Amino acid sequence: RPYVYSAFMDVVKALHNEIVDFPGFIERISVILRDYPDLLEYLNIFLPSSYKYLLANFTLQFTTPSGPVSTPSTYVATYNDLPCTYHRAIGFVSRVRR
Amino acid sequence: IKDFLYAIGIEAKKFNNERKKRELEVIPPDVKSALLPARTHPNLPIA
Amino acid sequence: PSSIFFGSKPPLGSFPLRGIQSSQFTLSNISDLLSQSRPDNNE
Amino acid sequence: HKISVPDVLKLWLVDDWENITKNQQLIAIPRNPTVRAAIAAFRESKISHLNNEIDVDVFEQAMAGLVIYFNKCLGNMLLYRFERQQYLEIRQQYPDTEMCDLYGVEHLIRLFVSLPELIDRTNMDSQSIECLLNYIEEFLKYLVLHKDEYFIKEYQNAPPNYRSLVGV
Amino acid sequence: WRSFLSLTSLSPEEFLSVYNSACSDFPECGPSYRLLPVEERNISCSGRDDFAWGILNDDWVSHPTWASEESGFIVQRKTPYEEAMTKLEEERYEFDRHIEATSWTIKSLKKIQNRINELPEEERETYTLEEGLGLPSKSIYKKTIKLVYTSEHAEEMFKALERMPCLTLPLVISRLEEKNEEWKSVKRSLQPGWRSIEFKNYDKSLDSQCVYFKARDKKNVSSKFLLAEADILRSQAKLHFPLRSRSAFEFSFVYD
Amino acid sequence: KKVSYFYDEDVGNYHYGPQHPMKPHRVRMVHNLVVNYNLYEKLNVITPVRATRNDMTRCHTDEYIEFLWRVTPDTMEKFQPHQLKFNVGDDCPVFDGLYEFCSISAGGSIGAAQELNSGNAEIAINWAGGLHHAKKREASGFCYVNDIALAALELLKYHQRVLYIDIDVHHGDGVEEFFYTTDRVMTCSFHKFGEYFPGTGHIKDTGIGTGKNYAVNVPLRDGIDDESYESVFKPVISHIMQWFRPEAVILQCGTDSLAGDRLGCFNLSMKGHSMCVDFVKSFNLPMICVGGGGYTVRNVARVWTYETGLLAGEELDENLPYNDYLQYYGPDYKLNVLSNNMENHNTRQYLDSITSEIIENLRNLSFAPS
Amino acid sequence: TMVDVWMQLCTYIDSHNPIQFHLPHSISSFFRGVGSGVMGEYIETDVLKHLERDPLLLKSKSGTPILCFRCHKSALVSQSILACDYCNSYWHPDCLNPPLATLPSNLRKWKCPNHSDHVTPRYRLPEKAKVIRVGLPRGFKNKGNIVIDENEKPFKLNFLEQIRDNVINLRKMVEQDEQLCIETFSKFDFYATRDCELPLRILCDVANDNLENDDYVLALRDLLRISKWDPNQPVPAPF
Numbered sequence A: 001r002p003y004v005y006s007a008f009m010d011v012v013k014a015l016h017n018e019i020v021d022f023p024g025f026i027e028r029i030s031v032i033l034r035d036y037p038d039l040l041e042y043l044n045i046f047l048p049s050s051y052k053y054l055l056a057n058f059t060l061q062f063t064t065p066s067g068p069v070s071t072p073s074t075y076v077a078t079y080n081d082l083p084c085t086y087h088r089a090i091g092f093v094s095r096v097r098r
Numbered sequence B: 001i002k003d004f005l006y007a008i009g010i011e012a013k014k015f016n017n018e019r020k021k022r023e024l025e026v027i028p029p030d031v032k033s034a035l036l037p038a039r040t041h042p043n044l045p046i047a
Numbered sequence C: 001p002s003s004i005f006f007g008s009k010p011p012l013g014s015f016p017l018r019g020i021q022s023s024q025f026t027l028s029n030i031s032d033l034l035s036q037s038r039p040d041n042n043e
Numbered sequence D: 001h002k003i004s005v006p007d008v009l010k011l012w013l014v015d016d017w018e019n020i021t022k023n024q025q026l027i028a029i030p031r032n033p034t035v036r037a038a039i040a041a042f043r044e045s046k047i048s049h050l051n052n053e054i055d056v057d058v059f060e061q062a063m064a065g066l067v068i069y070f071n072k073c074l075g076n077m078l079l080y081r082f083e084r085q086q087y088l089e090i091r092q093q094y095p096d097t098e099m100c101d102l103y104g105v106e107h108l109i110r111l112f113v114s115l116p117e118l119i120d121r122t123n124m125d126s127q128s129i130e131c132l133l134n135y136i137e138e139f140l141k142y143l144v145l146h147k148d149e150y151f152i153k154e155y156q157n158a159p160p161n162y163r164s165l166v167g168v
Numbered sequence E: 001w002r003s004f005l006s007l008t009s010l011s012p013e014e015f016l017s018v019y020n021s022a023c024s025d026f027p028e029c030g031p032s033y034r035l036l037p038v039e040e041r042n043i044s045c046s047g048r049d050d051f052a053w054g055i056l057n058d059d060w061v062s063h064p065t066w067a068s069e070e071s072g073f074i075v076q077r078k079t080p081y082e083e084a085m086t087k088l089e090e091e092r093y094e095f096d097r098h099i100e101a102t103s104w105t106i107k108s109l110k111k112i113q114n115r116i117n118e119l120p121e122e123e124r125e126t127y128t129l130e131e132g133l134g135l136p137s138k139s140i141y142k143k144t145i146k147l148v149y150t151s152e153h154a155e156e157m158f159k160a161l162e163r164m165p166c167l168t169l170p171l172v173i174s175r176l177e178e179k180n181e182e183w184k185s186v187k188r189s190l191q192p193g194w195r196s197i198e199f200k201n202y203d204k205s206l207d208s209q210c211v212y213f214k215a216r217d218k219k220n221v222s223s224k225f226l227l228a229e230a231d232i233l234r235s236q237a238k239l240h241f242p243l244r245s246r247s248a249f250e251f252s253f254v255y256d
Numbered sequence F: 001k002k003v004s005y006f007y008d009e010d011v012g013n014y015h016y017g018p019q020h021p022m023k024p025h026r027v028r029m030v031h032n033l034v035v036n037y038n039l040y041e042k043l044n045v046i047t048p049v050r051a052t053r054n055d056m057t058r059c060h061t062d063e064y065i066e067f068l069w070r071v072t073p074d075t076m077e078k079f080q081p082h083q084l085k086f087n088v089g090d091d092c093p094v095f096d097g098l099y100e101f102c103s104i105s106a107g108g109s110i111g112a113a114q115e116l117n118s119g120n121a122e123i124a125i126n127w128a129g130g131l132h133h134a135k136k137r138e139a140s141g142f143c144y145v146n147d148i149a150l151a152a153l154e155l156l157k158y159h160q161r162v163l164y165i166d167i168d169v170h171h172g173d174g175v176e177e178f179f180y181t182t183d184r185v186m187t188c189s190f191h192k193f194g195e196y197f198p199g200t201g202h203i204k205d206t207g208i209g210t211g212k213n214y215a216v217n218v219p220l221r222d223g224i225d226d227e228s229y230e231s232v233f234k235p236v237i238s239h240i241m242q243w244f245r246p247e248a249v250i251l252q253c254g255t256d257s258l259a260g261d262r263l264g265c266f267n268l269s270m271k272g273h274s275m276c277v278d279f280v281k282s283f284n285l286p287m288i289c290v291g292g293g294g295y296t297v298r299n300v301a302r303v304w305t306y307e308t309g310l311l312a313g314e315e316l317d318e319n320l321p322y323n324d325y326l327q328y329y330g331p332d333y334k335l336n337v338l339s340n341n342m343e344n345h346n347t348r349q350y351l352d353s354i355t356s357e358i359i360e361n362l363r364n365l366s367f368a369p370s
Numbered sequence G: 001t002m003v004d005v006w007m008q009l010c011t012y013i014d015s016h017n018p019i020q021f022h023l024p025h026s027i028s029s030f031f032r033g034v035g036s037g038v039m040g041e042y043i044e045t046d047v048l049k050h051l052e053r054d055p056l057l058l059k060s061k062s063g064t065p066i067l068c069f070r071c072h073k074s075a076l077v078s079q080s081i082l083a084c085d086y087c088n089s090y091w092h093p094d095c096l097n098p099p100l101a102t103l104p105s106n107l108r109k110w111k112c113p114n115h116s117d118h119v120t121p122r123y124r125l126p127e128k129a130k131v132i133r134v135g136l137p138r139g140f141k142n143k144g145n146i147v148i149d150e151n152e153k154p155f156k157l158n159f160l161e162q163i164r165d166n167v168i169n170l171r172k173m174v175e176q177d178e179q180l181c182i183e184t185f186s187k188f189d190f191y192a193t194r195d196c197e198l199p200l201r202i203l204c205d206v207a208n209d210n211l212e213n214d215d216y217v218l219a220l221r222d223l224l225r226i227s228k229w230d231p232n233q234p235v236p237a238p239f
Ligand SMILES: [Zn+2]
Pocket: F168, F169, F170, F254, F256, F292, F293, F294
């Protein structure tokens, strides 16, 4: 299945060249279809976010909090954008200060 | 082909010529440009 | 760090978490003009 | 029996055909250069260089025939099916003025270009025919020369109420 | 592509900024708006002020039907079950519209009667109303009187109630009440057939594939389409991976 | 009681024609379900004050409104020419009490705006209104007077920026044409583009003049469902509220985008059509919820009753209580509108492409030097 | 004389029944593309010369495969594909830059985005137009659009040696790339997943960085200030 291989190497190359911003490489596992490469990527991935496989009936990914469950729709092109989080910070600090 | 290579060479040098940006202002909003330590000035004395 | 991972739905009353582009049927949703026009590493 | 229309005028006529028919654009009816005005300008310019009194007379009577035929002809074989609404509106607005004082060179040239097929049915003397046709040729040349002043520059879009009115 | 961007001297950031705006050439006003003549740009609006004139738009008009896209000329074909449900709804609307209009007019005229009757007796005998009886919404009253009586006795009864209200009101209230009771009895007598039609047709009105899936599954079950799928997947793999795809698989099913 | 509910007890008695889709009877259905759910206490009920010719000539022309005041189904034969000039007579039929119905709806909208201005309320509900196809000089699409535009003008007297969100299956052509050249009103409309009624609504219609990038059009294909609509609706509205921060929202809660509609071609349910209202309520901005389309009265009544309850805060029961219109509701008698199958056509690539384009347009308002 | 010509013209016109205008056949058949209609209208003569649109195309009449031009997929990742009526190309109706909501009408020819006539100013050629071959080698003003087609070893290797070598080289490049990336993990995590709380720091404790000041410019451009003093860093109030 050369498509999954090419997709994997493309995602890792994008993470190298800084296009897909590590939350964005942890997802784009819409190519799940198998639990063994995830269990094998365990020992190489570490944030406290190692994947989690419970019977791949559910593929919820760890974090320092309790960890998000995978979305039904595909890992829809989540790239990072700085002005958004900056405006969210402005709003939150204004609210807390008030 | 030989015309486009010469046509783009002149246009490219003209863009690099104007790419050198060194300006000082206070209270224009102009672009999301290269030299904006300006905004540090009007927001500073109050904060 | 938990609310940053699959954040394509803005939660309820907040400005967007992450930005969205297209993925031209690629099975690796990166591949784009972003991919084809970014540095990997007579003319 | 044939005429020599410049290519610029041919292009302009086809562009106006398209604009009025398919794109739903009309011409502002009250013109700044009048049909009578252009007729008088060309008449003055040609007489100022004419040679003998017989030629003066035939040119004068030719111009008179031209203006009377325009005034008698415009509303019968010179407009498209998308302009009859505008025509009746203009007749209601100015029922005392006349077409020679209302319309413009954009329609005078339709008259000129269509003259051959009309002289096809008419069968007067070849001398009169050739005089009139040479006069039309010189007029077309003068218009395409002074394009900048006589011809309109941009067309006008018909409003929704106008389009619902015409509907054809 | 990187070589072309190097020739043009365009950074990838600036290319991504310029792409969406400089690829497709559309007019600035959009593909559906167009400018107006100067004549009809100042039609009267006797209620506007300077603040409204500054904000509202009077220059660019939209295309309702005059472009190549006139309007919606393709009506969505519905399933017979949805059509039956629509017919049922329409029947109910007819009955209920008539009953409720009659009832509303009965109530309004009863209010007028209560006012003029609480009024003492001298003014009771010498009272009068105006054309429309002062109802803020006279259309319902006019329509219901027309319908209940006729296209001919309507004017007679109207003038009668206009001139002599205190005597005429009880009779018209009685007549409207009687006809309303008749309509209500007919509605109660017709209800169970409606319930039956609704029951029989409800679920199939959501089950739209019950009608539209046979003609779409015959294609997937056919053989020519399957062979074509195989061939096109082979071509696609050969175009994508030229070095590989001599060891690839067109289809990989999992049977667990 | 911060929800001001407008309802005139006459609105349900106006009749369009023999078999017409638009029926003002739905407002009466909604009100009966409300009064029997007991929301009448948690709401604030105001019988509206009728509009005037001077109030409607703010957005419409004097000749057009005078025609609407003078027309009658009998004198229509003599008024024939002006009819075909003003678009009244084919799909916007001339019926009894046309001016009265228009006055009721426009008065509801103007009163909602005045309530939001005076501060007596923060949410103002008017279902009789929402006619968003009316234009400056002609009726269109079962609409005669643009109460949305009149309401926006009344809001702008006190508020500096106003957002208008259309989730009717058709384009908000009238309101867009009204506010096409201004930056104080931004019009975001989600609609079905292609071979459909208004014809207008390309992704490229983005305004001209000062109102460049202040019309937002989201075209969609046949058969959108709850998840797809959410994925296109939440990002775009969040980005709008970020870049163009409004002080007041006007939400056209049109329910022809539901499933099983005589004229719509969408697949939303009661939940998918109400997550929109919830997302917009979640910003704590003053808002006017106006009605709109909707041509299947049972679905319309139940969905609008649920949305009224959700704005008031109360979570209504699941069984319909005893009302005078019970038989209208099907063999289940529940407060819900399920979706059908109607295979979708909106691919993720299509939705993502249109969303990215809209986001770039909204961002250009603050990037992109002046 | 021409007086009599005028008399005969007047007699003809007031004797006959009015009709609508049509310019002579010479002017009409002059240009290329233009042509009359059923009711004297102007219609361009570029329509489908063959005669609902077949949504999914898989095989071509020439055996050439049907793959989209931009994404190289096969009309099955998306339920519809489009065939350009001018070149041998196929496009997904979703891959075009403004994605087409509905497929075009099967009457009018459709033109893919890979042609130069989309950005040329329209012109008209006469229908007697000898294609001139311009000899000027460089510097020819040509109005951008009227330049027609720019008219002017068998090895028998038979080995898989180079194919095997290329496969091993690809695997080696992949191995090195994966090694570098999976070592830069545990730092990608820290600098990309906690990146949402450091902005909170430089917002709360208001330290001026470039992006903070750009956000303040964004808020000023939203509020539309003119000439008054900027209030403060935390008190511009689109709160
Ligand atoms: Zn609608």
